[PDB]
Amino acid sequence: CFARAIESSRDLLHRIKDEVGAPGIVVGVSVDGKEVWSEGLGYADVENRVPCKPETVMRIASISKSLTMVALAKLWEAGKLDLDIPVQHYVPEFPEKEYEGEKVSVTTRLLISHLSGIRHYGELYLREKFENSIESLRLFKNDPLFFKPGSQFLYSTFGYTLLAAIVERASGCKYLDYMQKIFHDLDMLTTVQEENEPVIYNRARFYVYNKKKRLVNTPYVDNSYKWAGGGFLSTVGDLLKFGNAMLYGYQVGLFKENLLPGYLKPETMVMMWTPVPNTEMSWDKEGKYAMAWGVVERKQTYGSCRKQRHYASHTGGAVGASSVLLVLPEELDTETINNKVPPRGIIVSIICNMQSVGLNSTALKIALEFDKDRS
Amino acid sequence: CFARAIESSRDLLHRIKDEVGAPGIVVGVSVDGKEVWSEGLGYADVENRVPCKPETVMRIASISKSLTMVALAKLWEAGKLDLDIPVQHYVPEFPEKEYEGEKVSVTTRLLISHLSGIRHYGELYLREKFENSIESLRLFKNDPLFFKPGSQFLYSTFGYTLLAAIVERASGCKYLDYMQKIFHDLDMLTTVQEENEPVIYNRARFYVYNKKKRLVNTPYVDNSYKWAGGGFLSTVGDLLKFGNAMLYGYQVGLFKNSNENLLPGYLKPETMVMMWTPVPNTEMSWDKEGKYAMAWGVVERKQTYGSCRKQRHYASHTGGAVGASSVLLVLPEELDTETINNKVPPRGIIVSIICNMQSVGLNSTALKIALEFDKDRS
Amino acid sequence: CFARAIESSRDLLHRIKDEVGAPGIVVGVSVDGKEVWSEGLGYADVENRVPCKPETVMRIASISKSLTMVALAKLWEAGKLDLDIPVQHYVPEFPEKEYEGEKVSVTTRLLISHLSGIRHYGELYLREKFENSIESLRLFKNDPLFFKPGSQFLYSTFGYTLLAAIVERASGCKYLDYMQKIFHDLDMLTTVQEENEPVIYNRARFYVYNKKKRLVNTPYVDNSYKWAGGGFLSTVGDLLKFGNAMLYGYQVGLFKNSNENLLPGYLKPETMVMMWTPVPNTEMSWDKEGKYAMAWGVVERKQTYGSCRKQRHYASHTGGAVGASSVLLVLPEELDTETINNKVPPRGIIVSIICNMQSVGLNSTALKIALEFDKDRS
Amino acid sequence: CFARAIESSRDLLHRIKDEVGAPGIVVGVSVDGKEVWSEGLGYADVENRVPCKPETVMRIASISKSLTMVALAKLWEAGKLDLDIPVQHYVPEFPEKEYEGEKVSVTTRLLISHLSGIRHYGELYLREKFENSIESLRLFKNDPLFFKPGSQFLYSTFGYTLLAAIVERASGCKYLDYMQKIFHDLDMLTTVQEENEPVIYNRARFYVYNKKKRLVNTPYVDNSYKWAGGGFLSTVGDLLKFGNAMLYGYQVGLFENLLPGYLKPETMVMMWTPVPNTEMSWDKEGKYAMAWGVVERKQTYGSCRKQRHYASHTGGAVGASSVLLVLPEELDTETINNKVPPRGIIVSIICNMQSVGLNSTALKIALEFDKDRS
C-alpha cells in the first residue's frame, strides 16, 4: 500500500518544520477519495503542552476565498447572480468608481480574479467586531482604485469582503448562514468562522518569533471584517472533503448512470479551473491564478525537458499561521474511464501555527510521492 | 495524619464547584509552614481538555493588593516612604483636590485602606497597552473625589495604581522590577504580571455564562492599567508561600525568647502588627464580622456573651477578575505558653483557592477547610 | 528508576527546544556517580537527517575554561606554578603593563577569575590556523588594559589563552598534550580540540537563524586562537565524568574516617575547596544569586529570612560558541551524619546539556532537571 | 531487461573504488532517455555514517563548463551574443592585450575551447566570497597572456569566469539567475551553486589522503570566484537529464510530430565538432570541443579497432571527482523510421575522492549497457 510514501512525506514535513521552526504542523493526504494519511507533529498549545493531532483546528486564510467562490458558483448556477453586471446593482452602498476621469465598472467576474483596481491594504490588526458585511465595507469603500480595472493584477483581501456582501445581497440570506449550509452539504462538520466567544474544541494557538529570536504569542486579532479571505477555522480532514468534492465535480462529466451528480455542474468547475491572462500565481511561478485558486497546466515545450503537471492549489497566511490545500488530478486513460470511478487524484492539506511559511512545495512533493505509489 | 480533613475539604470543593458551575478549581492547604494538600478538579482549558492541577496559573484580582502592600511596607521600613505626607510629594502629576470648597489632602495610609475619596469605576474592559503607571494615571486623575477623604470607605482599584506610581517614585526603580525582586525573595517563582505576548506555561482559560445558560469565553482584556490590583498570575503553591512568610513575620516576635536563633521575618514584627490591625469606619465585604486592615480583611477574636459564638481571628483576601475568582486565607492558632517555649513559627493554616469562573465567593469555603484542618491538627 | 524525573526533564527539554527553535538537544544526567539518563531530541545534521544521540559531539565553549583550570590546579599541586607571581616570569612575550599613572602586575590567580584588565574582544570569526599559544598571543599582547587589574570584573576569553601559554611555560610540555593526558586520566575518551582536518566521528553541525527567520549554517570558523576557552568538543557522557570526578574530589575529605578505603580524589580537598569558593567583586552572569569562583559559577547556601527562599548550593558553567550552546551543572547534596557514616562519595547530581543553536541559556533548565532528580532520589 | 549489465557495472565501480580508496561513489545510467540504473556504494559522510545514495549531491568541477556553454549557446541563438567580436565589447573591464609586442584579440569562441592566451592558474584554495563575476575578474585581469591567442591549447578555468561575466553583460541579468532558469527548464531541480550558508539537503563530504596514508577532511574552500567552472552541486539524476536533453537536441534533426530540442540542431552539431590543434586529456584519441571532449568515429585500418563516437567531460574538484558521458547509437534506416529520439546511453559517475579518473569506467559501463540494449 502507501507504507513507503508516508515515511518520505514525514521526512519532508520534518524538514519544513525544522527549517521554519514551527511549533507544530498537521498534514492530511487523501488518495482517490479515500483518506490514507493524517499526521500531527509538535504542539498545538506550547504553554499547555497540547500535542498536534488530526482533530486540531487552525486558521486558514486564503482557502476561505475558494470556499466563498463555491457560494458564488452556486448563486451563478441558481441564476440569481450575473458575473458581468457591475456590482452596484447588488451593492448600491459601493460608490460608482471613476478612474482618472473616466467612469469604470467593477464586476464580479473582474473582482474574483483580483483584477479590479482595489488596492492591497495588507495585514491590519483590527480588534473590532463587525455584525454585517455592509458595515465591514466602510474600511475601503471611500478609497479610490489604485489601477484601472481589468488592466493589472493586484492581490487584495477586501475584494472578497465585497464578494461576501454580494453573496448576502443575491442569496437573500446572511453570508455566514449560506456558508454554514454549504459546509453542511459538503460534510465539513468542523469548518467555522474564527470568533472568540464560542467554545471551539481542539482550538490551537498561533505563535511568532520576536526580535530576540524567541517564540512568543501573536497579538489578539478579530477577523470579522474579513470572514472571506480570512477568518475561518478548519481541520485538515475538512479541507480533504472540500478538495475531494471539487475534484469529483470536475471529473464526473468525463466519466461515463451509476455516478452521482457533482456538487457543481462540470461546466462550472471547468470555468473555475481555467487560468486568466495577465495574472500571476505567487506561490508557483509556472502557474496563473484562476477563480480563487492557483492553476498550473500541463505543457512540455521541448523534448527530454521538464513536463509540467496540472494541479490546483491555494496557500493562505494568517497572523501566526500558514496553510496550503493542493489538488493533483491524475491522468485519465481510456481504461480508468471505462472501469474506475471519480475522484481520481490526490488532495494534500498542510497547516502549521507559524507565520510566513511557504507550504506549497511540500504539498506538491507529498502529492507526487503518493502518486508514485498509487495502486 | 490529615486523611480525614482532606476528604471533607474535597467534598466542600465539589459543593462550591457544582453550585457555581465552575469548569475547574484548584486548592492549596499548608499547615504549620509545610504544604500538606494541593488538589485540582475539573478542566483548566475546556476546549483542549487540559485538567486543573497545582501547577495551573490563574488570575488573582485582589491578592495583588497585598503583594503591593509588601512593597509599600518594605519602602516604609527602608525610610524611603512616609505614610502621612500627601501623595503629591511623590507624584506631582496627581492634581490637588478641593471638596465643597475646602482643599483636602490625600495621604498614603488613607488611600491604602480605601478611605480616600477616589470613586469606584468598576471593571472596565480596556485593551490598551500601558508602559508605566504614570501614563496609566490619566484614566482617573482629572476626576474629582467622590467623598471626603478619611470620612467614608469605598473599595477602589485605581487607588492601588496610584500606590504603584508612588512605589516607582519612592524606590527609585520600576514597580514591576521591584515586585519581581520581592517575589524572588519570597520564593514565589511563578508569580508574574498578566500579559499576552510572553509564553507563560500552564496558563489557564477563564470562562463565563451567557444569557443562554451556556459556557463561553470571556472577552479579551488587558490589565496593564491596573498591575497593582488584578494584574498578576500565580499558582496556589505561591500564595501558600506568601501566606507562610506573612504568618512567620507576624508570629516570630512572640516566639523569640525561647530559641533566640530564629531567622528574622521578612518585615519587622511591628510592621506586620500594624498591617493586620483593622482600621475603624471600614467594612469587610466578604465577611461581615471583620474589618479591612492594610490590603487585608481581618476578623478579630471576641466573645460578647457567655455560651455564644466566639469570633475566630483570621486574615483573608478574596478577589474577582474577568472570568476568575480567588481567595487567600491565613488562620493563626492560639499561642499557649507551651507552644511559645517548645514550638517554632509559623503556627497556623494557609488556604488558597482559585477557580476559572466569574463572581464566585470562595471565602466561606476556605474558612471551612481551614477549620477542618485546624481541628485535625497534629 | 527515576521515571517521574526523567519525564519531567524531557518535558523541560522540549520546552526549551521549542522556545528557541533549536534543531537538536542532548542531555546527560548522572546521580551519585552512576549515569542514570542520556537523551537526544532532534537532528544533529539537518541536511543529512542525522538524529541527535548521546554519542553526538558538540562545541563546548566555556566548559573548556574549567578543563584548563584543572590543569592549572595540577600544576599548582605539583609546585610548578605560582598563582601570586606575575605572568612575565613564565611568559616574557607578554609585555609589562602600566595602567594610567602606575605600573601594574598581572598574576595567574588574578587572571583566572577574569579580574585583570584584559578587555573583552568578543567573538571574532577568525579562519587562520595557529600552531602554538605564543603566536596566538599576538592578537592582544600589544593592546593595553581596559581596567586596573584587581579592581573590576570583566569576562574575557583571551585571558585563558594567556593561561594556556602559562601552562605550556610552567609544565614544560605542549598545552594540548597536557590536556590530552588529563582527559585520558579522567576517562573522557571523546573530548578533543575542535579542528577540521581529522575525522571526528559523530561530529554535529551548528546552525543559526538569518534575517528572514530561516535556519542556516553558521560560517566556518577556526578556534585555534582560543584552545583554552572555546576550543573543545565532547559528548554529554564526558562532561558527566568530569563533573563526577570534581564532585568526588570535593567530598572525599568530608567522607574520611568512615569506610576510609576511599580512593583519593584527582585534586586535593584543599585544591577543590579553593576552586569552588566565590571571590568578591565578581559576578556570575547566568545566575544573579551566585558569584564567579575560579572557572566556575558558584551559588552558596543561605536563608536570610524565615519562611522565605533558601538558596541551594551548586556549581555550574555555561558556554556559548558559534552555533552552539552548552551547560554543565553540579548539585551536591547536603551531608547528614547518616550519609557520611554509611554512604560513599560522590553524593550529588550532575546535569550536562548541549544544543546546536546559538545564544541559548540552558542554566535554569539544568538546575530544574537537577532539582527534579533530587526530589525523586531513592 | 538489463539484469546482466548492472552486475558488470557494479563490479567495475567496486574496482575503481577499491583502486583509489574512495569512501563512496554514485552512478547513474540512462538508456534511450529513460533512467535504467542509479546506485550508490559507500558512505557520503564517513564521520556520521551516512551512506551514499542516488539523492546524494556532490561537487561537479568541469561539467559546470558544459552547463555554461548551454547558456552561451542560448544567447548565441537569441542573437544577443556574437562569438567573433572581441570580448572587450561586452566586458570593458578586461584590458586590451599585447603579445610579443603586437596587439592581439580574444574572442568568445576562442575562449570557449581554451584556445586563448589566458594562463592556467590551477587550483587555488580561496575562502573569500564574491558577489558578482565583475569583481571576480580581478584575480587574472592584469596578468598578461601566456600564449598568442588561437595558437596553442591550454586548459584554463578563469576563462570561464570571464565567460560568466560575458553572460552577465550580454543577457542583461545575473549569471546565477540565468543558469537557474536553464536548470528549471531542463528539470534539473537539484543542481545549485556550491555555497555554505544555505541548507542544501543530502550534501556530501569530500575527503583526501594525507602523508600518513590516512583519510582526512579536505580544507574549507569557497568557489565563488569560480561559479562558471566548478562551484556547482548536482546529483547523478540531474546530469542524466542534462545529457538526455543534449542528445535529444543533437538527434531530433535527423529524425513526424516531435517536440523541438532545447537548442537548434545546427547549434548542437556546432557544439559537438572537435576543434583542430586541441587535445583531450582524459582520452588521447579525441579532441576538445565546446566544453565537451568528443571522440569521433573512424577505423584507420581493416580488421582493427574502430573508434566509437562519444562525448564526455570529467571534472576534478577539491576532494571530489566526476564524469558525464554520452554515447549515441548508430542510426540505421529502421530506427529512424520506427523510433523516437533520444537513442543512446548517458552515464554519470561522482565520487568524493581527489584526483580520480572515471572516464574509462563510464565508457565501459556505457558499452555494457549498449551490448544488452533490447
Side-chain angles (χ1 to χ4, degrees), chain C residues 43-60:
Chain C
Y43 294 108
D45 191 10
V46 175
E47 298 178 352
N48 278 295
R49 321 302 296 159
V50 178
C52 285
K53 40 191 172 295
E55 302 92 10
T56 304
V57 310
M58 292 185 172
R59 285 171 178 155
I60 61 173

PDB file of all heavy atoms in Angstrom, chain C residues 43-60:
ATOM      1  N   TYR C  43      17.739  16.694  15.466  1.00  0.00           N
ATOM      2  CA  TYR C  43      18.684  16.287  14.436  1.00  0.00           C
ATOM      3  C   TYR C  43      20.020  16.978  14.658  1.00  0.00           C
ATOM      4  O   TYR C  43      20.067  18.196  14.850  1.00  0.00           O
ATOM      5  CB  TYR C  43      18.153  16.627  13.040  1.00  0.00           C
ATOM      6  CG  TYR C  43      16.928  15.843  12.642  1.00  0.00           C
ATOM      7  CD1 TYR C  43      15.684  16.449  12.585  1.00  0.00           C
ATOM      8  CD2 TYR C  43      17.013  14.497  12.335  1.00  0.00           C
ATOM      9  CE1 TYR C  43      14.562  15.738  12.229  1.00  0.00           C
ATOM     10  CE2 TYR C  43      15.899  13.777  11.976  1.00  0.00           C
ATOM     11  CZ  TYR C  43      14.676  14.401  11.924  1.00  0.00           C
ATOM     12  OH  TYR C  43      13.561  13.685  11.563  1.00  0.00           O
ATOM     13  N   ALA C  44      21.102  16.199  14.632  1.00  0.00           N
ATOM     14  CA  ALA C  44      22.439  16.778  14.683  1.00  0.00           C
ATOM     15  C   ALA C  44      22.848  17.378  13.346  1.00  0.00           C
ATOM     16  O   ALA C  44      23.487  18.435  13.315  1.00  0.00           O
ATOM     17  CB  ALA C  44      23.458  15.726  15.114  1.00  0.00           C
ATOM     18  N   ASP C  45      22.496  16.724  12.243  1.00  0.00           N
ATOM     19  CA  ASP C  45      22.734  17.235  10.895  1.00  0.00           C
ATOM     20  C   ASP C  45      21.380  17.311  10.202  1.00  0.00           C
ATOM     21  O   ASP C  45      20.776  16.281   9.893  1.00  0.00           O
ATOM     22  CB  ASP C  45      23.707  16.349  10.125  1.00  0.00           C
ATOM     23  CG  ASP C  45      24.182  16.988   8.832  1.00  0.00           C
ATOM     24  OD1 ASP C  45      23.910  18.186   8.619  1.00  0.00           O
ATOM     25  OD2 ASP C  45      24.834  16.291   8.029  1.00  0.00           O
ATOM     26  N   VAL C  46      20.904  18.534   9.970  1.00  0.00           N
ATOM     27  CA  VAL C  46      19.600  18.720   9.344  1.00  0.00           C
ATOM     28  C   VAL C  46      19.643  18.309   7.877  1.00  0.00           C
ATOM     29  O   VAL C  46      18.695  17.711   7.359  1.00  0.00           O
ATOM     30  CB  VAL C  46      19.135  20.176   9.521  1.00  0.00           C
ATOM     31  CG1 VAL C  46      17.847  20.426   8.764  1.00  0.00           C
ATOM     32  CG2 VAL C  46      18.953  20.488  10.991  1.00  0.00           C
ATOM     33  N   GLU C  47      20.742  18.621   7.184  1.00  0.00           N
ATOM     34  CA  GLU C  47      20.833  18.319   5.759  1.00  0.00           C
ATOM     35  C   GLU C  47      20.801  16.818   5.500  1.00  0.00           C
ATOM     36  O   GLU C  47      20.126  16.356   4.575  1.00  0.00           O
ATOM     37  CB  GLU C  47      22.106  18.928   5.177  1.00  0.00           C
ATOM     38  CG  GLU C  47      22.170  20.438   5.265  1.00  0.00           C
ATOM     39  CD  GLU C  47      23.469  20.994   4.723  1.00  0.00           C
ATOM     40  OE1 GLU C  47      24.378  20.193   4.425  1.00  0.00           O
ATOM     41  OE2 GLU C  47      23.585  22.229   4.592  1.00  0.00           O
ATOM     42  N   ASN C  48      21.527  16.045   6.300  1.00  0.00           N
ATOM     43  CA  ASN C  48      21.634  14.606   6.110  1.00  0.00           C
ATOM     44  C   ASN C  48      20.686  13.815   6.998  1.00  0.00           C
ATOM     45  O   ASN C  48      20.741  12.582   6.992  1.00  0.00           O
ATOM     46  CB  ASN C  48      23.074  14.156   6.358  1.00  0.00           C
ATOM     47  CG  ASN C  48      23.959  14.358   5.152  1.00  0.00           C
ATOM     48  OD1 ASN C  48      23.765  13.728   4.116  1.00  0.00           O
ATOM     49  ND2 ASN C  48      24.936  15.245   5.276  1.00  0.00           N
ATOM     50  N   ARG C  49      19.822  14.492   7.758  1.00  0.00           N
ATOM     51  CA  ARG C  49      18.834  13.845   8.623  1.00  0.00           C
ATOM     52  C   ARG C  49      19.499  12.891   9.615  1.00  0.00           C
ATOM     53  O   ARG C  49      19.152  11.713   9.705  1.00  0.00           O
ATOM     54  CB  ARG C  49      17.767  13.119   7.801  1.00  0.00           C
ATOM     55  CG  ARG C  49      17.328  13.841   6.539  1.00  0.00           C
ATOM     56  CD  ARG C  49      16.778  15.217   6.846  1.00  0.00           C
ATOM     57  NE  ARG C  49      15.572  15.157   7.658  1.00  0.00           N
ATOM     58  CZ  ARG C  49      15.114  16.165   8.384  1.00  0.00           C
ATOM     59  NH1 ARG C  49      15.734  17.333   8.415  1.00  0.00           N
ATOM     60  NH2 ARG C  49      14.007  15.998   9.097  1.00  0.00           N
ATOM     61  N   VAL C  50      20.458  13.412  10.369  1.00  0.00           N
ATOM     62  CA  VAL C  50      21.184  12.641  11.374  1.00  0.00           C
ATOM     63  C   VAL C  50      20.603  12.986  12.741  1.00  0.00           C
ATOM     64  O   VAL C  50      20.760  14.129  13.193  1.00  0.00           O
ATOM     65  CB  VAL C  50      22.691  12.930  11.331  1.00  0.00           C
ATOM     66  CG1 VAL C  50      23.403  12.145  12.409  1.00  0.00           C
ATOM     67  CG2 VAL C  50      23.256  12.595   9.969  1.00  0.00           C
ATOM     68  N   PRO C  51      19.939  12.056  13.420  1.00  0.00           N
ATOM     69  CA  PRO C  51      19.336  12.379  14.715  1.00  0.00           C
ATOM     70  C   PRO C  51      20.382  12.621  15.790  1.00  0.00           C
ATOM     71  O   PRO C  51      21.514  12.140  15.713  1.00  0.00           O
ATOM     72  CB  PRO C  51      18.499  11.136  15.030  1.00  0.00           C
ATOM     73  CG  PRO C  51      19.164  10.047  14.286  1.00  0.00           C
ATOM     74  CD  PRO C  51      19.674  10.666  13.022  1.00  0.00           C
ATOM     75  N   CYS C  52      19.989  13.394  16.798  1.00  0.00           N
ATOM     76  CA  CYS C  52      20.829  13.560  17.973  1.00  0.00           C
ATOM     77  C   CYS C  52      20.777  12.307  18.834  1.00  0.00           C
ATOM     78  O   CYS C  52      19.760  11.612  18.903  1.00  0.00           O
ATOM     79  CB  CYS C  52      20.391  14.773  18.790  1.00  0.00           C
ATOM     80  SG  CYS C  52      20.862  16.361  18.087  1.00  0.00           S
ATOM     81  N   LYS C  53      21.892  12.018  19.490  1.00  0.00           N
ATOM     82  CA  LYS C  53      22.015  10.834  20.327  1.00  0.00           C
ATOM     83  C   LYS C  53      23.072  11.117  21.383  1.00  0.00           C
ATOM     84  O   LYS C  53      23.805  12.110  21.284  1.00  0.00           O
ATOM     85  CB  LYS C  53      22.373   9.594  19.490  1.00  0.00           C
ATOM     86  CG  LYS C  53      23.382   9.843  18.394  1.00  0.00           C
ATOM     87  CD  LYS C  53      23.464   8.651  17.462  1.00  0.00           C
ATOM     88  CE  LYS C  53      24.331   8.953  16.257  1.00  0.00           C
ATOM     89  NZ  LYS C  53      23.737  10.023  15.410  1.00  0.00           N
ATOM     90  N   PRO C  54      23.164  10.280  22.420  1.00  0.00           N
ATOM     91  CA  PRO C  54      24.178  10.514  23.459  1.00  0.00           C
ATOM     92  C   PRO C  54      25.605  10.578  22.940  1.00  0.00           C
ATOM     93  O   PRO C  54      26.450  11.206  23.588  1.00  0.00           O
ATOM     94  CB  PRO C  54      23.985   9.320  24.399  1.00  0.00           C
ATOM     95  CG  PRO C  54      22.551   8.991  24.266  1.00  0.00           C
ATOM     96  CD  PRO C  54      22.192   9.253  22.835  1.00  0.00           C
ATOM     97  N   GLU C  55      25.905   9.953  21.805  1.00  0.00           N
ATOM     98  CA  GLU C  55      27.253   9.943  21.254  1.00  0.00           C
ATOM     99  C   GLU C  55      27.580  11.187  20.439  1.00  0.00           C
ATOM    100  O   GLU C  55      28.728  11.342  20.015  1.00  0.00           O
ATOM    101  CB  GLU C  55      27.452   8.700  20.384  1.00  0.00           C
ATOM    102  CG  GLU C  55      27.223   7.398  21.119  1.00  0.00           C
ATOM    103  CD  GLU C  55      25.795   6.915  21.004  1.00  0.00           C
ATOM    104  OE1 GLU C  55      25.037   7.495  20.202  1.00  0.00           O
ATOM    105  OE2 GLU C  55      25.429   5.959  21.717  1.00  0.00           O
ATOM    106  N   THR C  56      26.611  12.069  20.212  1.00  0.00           N
ATOM    107  CA  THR C  56      26.852  13.271  19.426  1.00  0.00           C
ATOM    108  C   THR C  56      27.863  14.170  20.125  1.00  0.00           C
ATOM    109  O   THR C  56      27.751  14.425  21.326  1.00  0.00           O
ATOM    110  CB  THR C  56      25.542  14.026  19.213  1.00  0.00           C
ATOM    111  OG1 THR C  56      24.584  13.157  18.599  1.00  0.00           O
ATOM    112  CG2 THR C  56      25.755  15.234  18.331  1.00  0.00           C
ATOM    113  N   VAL C  57      28.848  14.655  19.374  1.00  0.00           N
ATOM    114  CA  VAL C  57      29.837  15.585  19.905  1.00  0.00           C
ATOM    115  C   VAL C  57      29.488  16.984  19.418  1.00  0.00           C
ATOM    116  O   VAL C  57      29.146  17.186  18.246  1.00  0.00           O
ATOM    117  CB  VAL C  57      31.276  15.187  19.514  1.00  0.00           C
ATOM    118  CG1 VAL C  57      31.522  13.730  19.822  1.00  0.00           C
ATOM    119  CG2 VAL C  57      31.566  15.467  18.064  1.00  0.00           C
ATOM    120  N   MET C  58      29.526  17.947  20.331  1.00  0.00           N
ATOM    121  CA  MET C  58      29.165  19.318  20.017  1.00  0.00           C
ATOM    122  C   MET C  58      30.212  20.249  20.602  1.00  0.00           C
ATOM    123  O   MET C  58      31.071  19.841  21.386  1.00  0.00           O
ATOM    124  CB  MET C  58      27.773  19.672  20.552  1.00  0.00           C
ATOM    125  CG  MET C  58      26.632  18.944  19.864  1.00  0.00           C
ATOM    126  SD  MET C  58      25.016  19.507  20.424  1.00  0.00           S
ATOM    127  CE  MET C  58      23.936  18.663  19.275  1.00  0.00           C
ATOM    128  N   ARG C  59      30.138  21.513  20.206  1.00  0.00           N
ATOM    129  CA  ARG C  59      31.043  22.514  20.744  1.00  0.00           C
ATOM    130  C   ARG C  59      30.693  22.820  22.192  1.00  0.00           C
ATOM    131  O   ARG C  59      29.547  23.150  22.508  1.00  0.00           O
ATOM    132  CB  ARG C  59      30.973  23.793  19.914  1.00  0.00           C
ATOM    133  CG  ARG C  59      31.680  23.714  18.584  1.00  0.00           C
ATOM    134  CD  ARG C  59      31.376  24.934  17.745  1.00  0.00           C
ATOM    135  NE  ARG C  59      32.092  24.906  16.478  1.00  0.00           N
ATOM    136  CZ  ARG C  59      31.697  25.536  15.382  1.00  0.00           C
ATOM    137  NH1 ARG C  59      30.589  26.256  15.363  1.00  0.00           N
ATOM    138  NH2 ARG C  59      32.430  25.439  14.278  1.00  0.00           N
ATOM    139  N   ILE C  60      31.682  22.710  23.072  1.00  0.00           N
ATOM    140  CA  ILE C  60      31.590  23.228  24.431  1.00  0.00           C
ATOM    141  C   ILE C  60      32.484  24.459  24.488  1.00  0.00           C
ATOM    142  O   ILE C  60      33.660  24.401  24.112  1.00  0.00           O
ATOM    143  CB  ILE C  60      31.983  22.173  25.479  1.00  0.00           C
ATOM    144  CG1 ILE C  60      33.430  21.713  25.300  1.00  0.00           C
ATOM    145  CG2 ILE C  60      31.063  20.972  25.380  1.00  0.00           C
ATOM    146  CD1 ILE C  60      33.919  20.807  26.399  1.00  0.00           C
TER     147      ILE C  60
END
